[PDB]
Design an enzyme around this catalytic site. Structure first.
Site, mmCIF file in Angstrom:
data_model
loop_
_atom_site.group_PDB
_atom_site.id
_atom_site.type_symbol
_atom_site.label_atom_id
_atom_site.label_comp_id
_atom_site.label_asym_id
_atom_site.label_seq_id
_atom_site.Cartn_x
_atom_site.Cartn_y
_atom_site.Cartn_z
ATOM 1 N N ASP B 48 32.217 14.525 6.662
ATOM 2 C CA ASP B 48 32.569 14.617 5.246
ATOM 3 C C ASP B 48 33.494 13.453 4.914
ATOM 4 O OD1 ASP B 48 32.747 16.380 2.666
ATOM 5 O OD2 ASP B 48 34.765 15.895 3.125
ATOM 6 N N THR B 81 33.205 10.559 -4.079
ATOM 7 C CA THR B 81 34.327 10.386 -3.164
ATOM 8 C C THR B 81 34.186 9.098 -2.364
ATOM 9 O OG1 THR B 81 34.540 12.798 -2.956
ATOM 10 C CG2 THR B 81 35.684 11.442 -1.326
ATOM 11 N N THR B 82 32.984 8.833 -1.846
ATOM 12 C CA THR B 82 32.781 7.649 -1.018
ATOM 13 C C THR B 82 32.353 6.446 -1.847
ATOM 14 O OG1 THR B 82 30.491 8.299 -0.530
ATOM 15 C CG2 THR B 82 32.201 9.027 1.006
ATOM 16 N N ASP B 386 30.438 23.809 -6.228
ATOM 17 C CA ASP B 386 29.552 22.651 -6.277
ATOM 18 C C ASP B 386 28.575 22.760 -7.440
ATOM 19 O OD1 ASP B 386 30.696 21.455 -4.105
ATOM 20 O OD2 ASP B 386 29.210 22.038 -2.701
#
Lengths: 543, 518
Positions: B48, B81-82, B386
């Site tokens: 994650d 996030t990434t 989610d």
């Protein structure tokens, strides 16, 4: 490199004296200035401050950068403490004081190496300061460019340059400046000052931004809830009631329900309840109130009595606005009515005095406008824009643009910025130096050169070539001194400074780059006094 | 001690590039694993992107700023996030030669980045396609994108139901020239608040329109449904009334004790009479209710709910409209709660609740989750979040952006077209963003296992001459159309990703000195 191995003065410590401590002092003051230097000017860059724990903050505030700097030499601490004092007298300029102070100390060290005694450097610097301050008084100007021309609009345009409203700044900047100029007042004992909290702001999404309105008075968001009264009342003058307590029919109690079987009893109750509240209405009418501004609302029977008396009862007023309207009209905001057993306004004691009240429709807003009070020194602006998002942002930009212009206007004694004062002093003090003919002119000349660190630093922070900008800057000021004794010129060339966005020399008075006089006089003295304290140290003992 | 000038610029970019490298493998469904070696004898393989960045210490403050970027992104939207970390790192890397080799002042670098952002935001819109957010079946297909490849994939029909109905209810769908334009503001964290009640299964969950209260009632047997609801909100307890001043009572004869007791009963009744005078049907008090007061009110034909905090009373007031009154005696007849469907006091899972479900949508709702255990309740909640994040992102804008690196490549190509038209030194740092955007389709190829140059070059050529829906197939590694292989993501995520990535890079690029001190 470090000063040690004294092998003299048999005490429990080391001795650092002479050129050793003097060079050390120069290194310390440069080490501090090298940190804060780049924060100078609105175009400068911020720096990161990291603590001993692992946290950090990023800021361009010179006061914070200096205070949170780890300084291991008292020669630098003197300049940090100087800045902390600067905040307590001016509130700004901390960056420019440290920058100047460091340059003066470096220049002074060169004079020492050339066999000028520190005492004569300190003396010459103070002599230069006296003339420098006298010079500032000559370039000193007051609040100008309001009659037949406006330069204050460039102040507002600058403050709006980062706001959504900026697109329409060619139209709105006039409202910011005019709203402030129109309300120039005197708070007490002839201070002569622009209001701090004047100029109420409304919004409505009825039209394009260029249709925003400036009202010379209070626009109170309220209505009268009836067409019986005209939209223009009180041609000659008006008495205005600013009330909170409602004019609603009396109730037995909020938690009690009236249950009547005989209609005759209910009618008697309703009439008595009207009779109770009509005491408030009658005393308002008898006190001569022509406009009744009630926060919690006015009942229908109560409005009827006002309408028949040719008095405009106003329903659902905003209490926060009535606070300012009441004061402007000389009225008292009435949180509750009473005398002893009954209620009254005491024969126009709570009422104020004003010229004219009108009921205006703003295209999806509606206000009662209070214009021409005994003393208001305020206004209202109604903002329009592309959408509701822009309306909230426009209000924020209006509050900010008003604050920036007021801060410039707050001082009645202002000088141009952009390096104008420093570069102008550079020329004046270089000329002064030539009239001495002995020793002080050496420190005076270096003092003048040191002043150029400011217009140099500003150019560097603008990402411009500082050598051409400073050379051109000085060229304009030199010309302004060449014609000075004759007053014969095509152009004064005076008050030209650095445009740190376009990279050119501009007239700062029209451009809008102004600083208060006190900033330049205090900054020059503050830098010198710290420099003298450090220049007076030719020995350090370290135990 | 300190790092000045180019030392700060190199140090800030160097650290940020190291952070970006950490997570380059985290992009795409084929994300590769990293081995996190703890100071202890353990090791974590969790892939994650958030956990990897969280659980790995960073040294340079610039790396800590990168961590804050990911934390901000997590709060704004449910994804990226990434993306913001990889992109921001590459933007800094692309600006690196311009600070050093071209000697371009940071001020110039920042100005171009702001312009490149403006243009990038336009392109992301231009390449996006609408979806009818009012078609529930279409919405279910979008929500499942964040539910599949999970154990709870078999819940996805109910998860979509719960997420979609709740977010639609709270969406501030309004516009006017007076009360302003919320612009479809959605805040699920405050408005969609979810409560977990033991008992039942995932299929028994329901979205309520109203407030779900966890406090018990004075009697378990009271009216559950009311024809004309009227609701009272009070702070002050119902108990013996005492004065504020000094009182001295001296009793000699025992007979007068009963008189005091009668007075105590009356004072409690008088409080209840003021409550009952306004014909209530449900009374809620923050403080307690005496045994006498409990019977005094119930016998009057109303229900009484106790120990409900001001925070809950504020929620009750929004869905009832009842005004909170401090002192009991001051209660007004205007305090009402009509058009409320139920005051159900059902005990569920051996726990008493009170429901104020109504026919109103006052910009709020509550999700009620059911489950046979706390583990089931937590599993439903954790996965439902989610689904709700996507429902928010989609319902906040009907435009969907193509995935598979297509959107980022489209920005690269379109920025190049504008770069040729941009005059001045700013042309160089402007290109920096155009090139940096390709880190996404490049990384996707690398993680898929293809040739990072040959496939990326073909991808760019397809966008240069053809459409902007061409992307990388996460499973095959081939260049495929993103409509044939739907991998579409809400525009909200793509707009915030490029926005916060460039802004973060600007925050580090403009810092030319880090100094120590306290």
């Amino acid at each position: 490199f470090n000063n040690s191995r004294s092998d003299t003065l048999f005490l429990g410590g080391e001795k650092i004296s002479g050129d050793d401590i003097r060079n050390q002092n120069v290194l310390a003051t440069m080490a501090v200035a090298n940190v804060v230097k780049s924060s100078l000017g609105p175009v400068g860059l911020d720096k990161m401050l990291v603590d001993d724990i692992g946290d950090f903050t990023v800021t361009n505030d010179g006061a914070t950068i200096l205070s949170l700097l780890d300084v291991q030499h008292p020669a630098g601490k003197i300049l940090v403490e100087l800045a902390q004092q600067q905040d307590r007298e001016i509130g700004d300029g901390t960056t420019s004081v440290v920058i100047i102070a460091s340059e003066l100390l470096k220049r002074a060290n060169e004079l020492v190496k050339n066999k000028i005694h520190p005492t004569t450097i300190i003396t010459g610097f103070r002599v230069a300061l006296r003339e420098a301050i006298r010079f500032i008084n000559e370039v000193l100007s007051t609040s100008v460019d309001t009659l037949g021309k406006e330069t204050l609009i460039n102040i507002a345009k600058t403050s709006m340059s980062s706001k959504i409203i900026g697109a329409d700044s060619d139209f709105f900047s006039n409202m910011v400046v005019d709203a402030l100029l129109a309300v120039k007042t005197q708070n007490s004992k002839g201070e002569i000052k622009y209001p701090v909290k004047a100029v109420n702001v409304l919004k409505a999404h009825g039209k394009s931004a260029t249709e925003s309105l400036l009202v010379p008075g209070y626009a109170l968001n309220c209505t009268v809830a009836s067409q019986a009264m005209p939209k223009r009342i009180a041609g000659g003058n008006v008495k205005i009631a600013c009330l909170d307590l409602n004019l609603q029919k009396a109730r037995m109690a909020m938690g009690v329900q009236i249950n009547i079987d005989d209609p005759e009893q209910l009618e008697q109750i309703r009439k008595r309840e009207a009779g109770i509240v009509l005491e408030r209405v009658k005393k308002i009418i008898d006190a001569g109130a022509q406009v009744v501004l009630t926060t919690k609302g006015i009942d229908d029977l109560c409005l009827k009595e006002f309408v028949e008396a040719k008095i405009m009862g106003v329903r659902r007023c905003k209490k926060e606005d009535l606070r300012r309207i009441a004061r402007a009209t000389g009225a008292t905001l009435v949180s509750s009515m009473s005398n002893l057993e009954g209620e009254e306004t005491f024969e126009s004691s709570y009422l104020g005095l004003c010229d004219e009240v009108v009921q205006a429709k703003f295209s999806d807003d509606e206000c009662i406008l209070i214009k021409g009070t005994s003393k208001h020194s305020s206004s209202s602006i109604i903002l329009r824009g592309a959408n509701d998002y822009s309306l909230d942002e426009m209000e924020r930009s209006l509050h900010d643009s008003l604050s920036v212009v007021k801060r410039t206007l707050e001082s009645g004694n202002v000088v141009p910025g952009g390096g104008c004062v420093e570069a102008a002093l550079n020329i004046y003090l270089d000329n002064f130096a030539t009239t001495v003919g002995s020793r002080e002119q050496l420190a005076i000349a270096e003092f003048a050169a040191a002043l150029l660190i400011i217009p140099k630093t500003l150019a560097v922070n603008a990402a411009k070539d500082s050598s051409e900008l400073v050379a051109k800057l000085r060229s304009y000021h030199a010309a302004s001194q060449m014609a000075k004794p004759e007053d014969v010129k095509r152009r004064s060339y005076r008050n030209y400074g650095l445009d740190l966005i376009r990279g050119k020399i501009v007239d700062e008075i029209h451009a809008g780059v102004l600083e208060p006089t006190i900033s330049k006089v205090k900054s020059l003295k503050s830098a010198l006094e710290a420099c003298v304290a450090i220049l007076r140290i030719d020995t350090m003992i370290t135990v | 001690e300190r790092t000045t000038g180019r030392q700060a610029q190199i140090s800030n970019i160097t650290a940020a590039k190291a952070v970006a490298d950490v997570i380059r493998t985290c992009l795409g469904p084929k994300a590769m694993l990293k081995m996190l070696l703890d100071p202890m004898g353990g090791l974590v393989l969790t892939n994650d992107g958030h956990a990897i960045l969280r659980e790995i210490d960073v040294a340079h403050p610039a790396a800590k700023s990168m961590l804050e970027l990911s934390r901000t992104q997590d709060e704004e939207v449910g994804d990226g996030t990434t993306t913001v970390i990889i992109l921001a790192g590459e933007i800094l890397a692309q600006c690196a030669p311009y600070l050093i080799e071209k000697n371009i002042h940071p001020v110039i670098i920042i100005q171009a980045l702001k312009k490149a952002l403006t243009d990038a935001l336009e392109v992301i819109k231009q390449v996006s396609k609408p979806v009818d957010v009012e078609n529930d079946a279409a919405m279910k297909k979008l929500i499942q994108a964040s539910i599949g490849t999970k154990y709870v994939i078999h819940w996805s029909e109910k998860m979509c139901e719960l997420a979609l109905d709740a977010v639609k209810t709270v969406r501030k769908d309004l516009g006017q020239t007076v009360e302003g334009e919320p612009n479809f503001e959605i805040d699920i964290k405050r408005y969609v608040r979810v409560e977990k009640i033991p008992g039942g299964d995932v299929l028994d969950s329901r979205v309520l329109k109203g407030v779900l209260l966890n406090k018990d009632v004075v009697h378990p047997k009271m009216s559950r449904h009311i024809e004309n609801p009227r609701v009272v909100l009070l702070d002050c307890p119902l108990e013996y009334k005492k004065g504020e001043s000094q009182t001295n009572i001296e009793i000699e004869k025992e007979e007068d004790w009963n008189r005091i007791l009668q007075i105590e009963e009356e004072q409690v009744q008088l409080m209840c009479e003021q409550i009952l005078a306004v014909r209530p049907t449900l009374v809620i008090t923050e403080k307690g209710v005496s045994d006498l007061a409990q019977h005094y009110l119930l016998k009057g034909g109303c229900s009484v709910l106790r120990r409900v905090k001001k925070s809950d009373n504020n929620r009750i007031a929004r869905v009832t409209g009842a005004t909170i009154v401090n002192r009991v005696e001051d209660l007004k007849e205007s305090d009402v709660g009509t058009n409320c469907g139920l005051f159900k006091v059902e005990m569920i899972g051996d726990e008493y609740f009170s429901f104020l479900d109504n026919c109103k949508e006052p910009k709020a709702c509550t999700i009620m989750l059911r489950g046979g255990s706390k583990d089931i309740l937590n599993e439903i909640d954790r996965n439902l979040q989610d689904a709700m994040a996507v429902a928010r992102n989609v319902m906040l804008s009907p435009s969907l952006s193509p995935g598979g690196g297509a959107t980022e490549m489209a920005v690269s190509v379109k920025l190049a077209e504008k770069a040729k038209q941009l005059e001045g030194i700013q042309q160089w740092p402007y290109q920096a963003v155009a090139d940096a955007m390709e880190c996404i389709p490049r990384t996707l190829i690398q993680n898929a296992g293809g040739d990072p140059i040959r496939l990326l070059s073909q991808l760019r050529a397809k966008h240069a001459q053809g459409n902007f829906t061409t992307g990388i197939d996460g499973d095959k590694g081939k260049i495929v159309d993103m409509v044939s292989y739907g991998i579409w993501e809400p525009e909200v995520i793509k707009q915030q990703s490029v926005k916060t990535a460039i802004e973060s890079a600007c925050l580090l690029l403009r810092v030319d000195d880090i100094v120590s001190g306290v």
